């Protein structure tokens, strides 16, 4: 059906600690691409400060091989799972 990806996701979005913007970004961007696809949300407007980046990082992908997005997402999440975990 699926791999460990939604798992990676599921875990990461809960984590004891809330990952740094970039950690969240990688995850986010890739998940969003692997799942939703091509940043179809749009770039921020009000308290942009800690949002933009997520937008941009996902955007940066906008068309990556979804599968890769998953692989990568998990393949990298490990760090979060080792640093933050549930």
UniProtKB/Swiss-Prot annotation:
Residues carrying N6-acetyllysine: 7, 18, 50, 54, 76
Residues in coiled coil: none
N6-succinyllysine sites (modified residues): 7, 16, 54, 76
A molecular function (GO) term: fatty-acyl-CoA binding
Keywords on record: Acetylation, Endoplasmic reticulum, Golgi apparatus, Hydroxylation, Lipid-binding, Phosphoprotein, Transport
Chain positions found as N6-malonyllysine: 54
Positions that bind an acyl-CoA: 13, 28-32, 50, 54, 73
GO biological process, one term: fatty acid metabolic process
Annotated positions of the N6-(2-hydroxyisobutyryl)lysine modification: 54
Modified residues (Phosphotyrosine): 28
Main location: endoplasmic reticulum
CDD domains, alphabetized: ACBP
PROSITE patterns (alphabetical): ACB_1, ACB_2
Keyword Transport: yes
InterPro entries (alphabetical): Acyl-CoA-binding_prot_CS (IPR022408), Acyl-CoA-binding_protein (IPR000582), Acyl-CoA-binding_sf (IPR035984), FERM/acyl-CoA-bd_prot_sf (IPR014352)
Keyword 4Fe-4S in annotation: no
Residues with the N-acetylserine modification: 1
Cell compartments where the protein resides: Endoplasmic reticulum; Golgi apparatus
GO CC terms, sorted: endoplasmic reticulum; Golgi apparatus
Start and end residues of each ACB domain: 1-86
Domain of life: Eukaryota
Function comment: Binds medium- and long-chain acyl-CoA esters with very high affinity and may function as an intracellular carrier of acyl-CoA esters. It is also able to displace diazepam from the benzodiazepine (BZD) recognition site located on the GABA type A receptor. It is therefore possible that this protein also acts as a neuropeptide to modulate the action of the GABA receptor.
Family that this chain belongs to: Belongs to the ACBP family.
Subunit organization: Monomer.
Name used for this protein in its record: Acyl-CoA-binding protein
């Amino acid at each position: 059906s699926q791999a460990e990806f939604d798992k990676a996701a599921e875990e990461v979005k809960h984590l004891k600690t809330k990952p740094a913007d970039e950690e969240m970004l990688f995850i986010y961007s890739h998940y969003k691409q692997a799942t939703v696809g091509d940043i179809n949300t749009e770039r921020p407007g009000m308290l942009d400060f800690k949002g933009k980046a997520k937008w941009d990082a996902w955007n940066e992908l906008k068309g990556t091989s979804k599968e890769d997005a998953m692989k990568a997402y998990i393949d990298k999440v490990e760090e979060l799972k080792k640093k933050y975990g549930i």
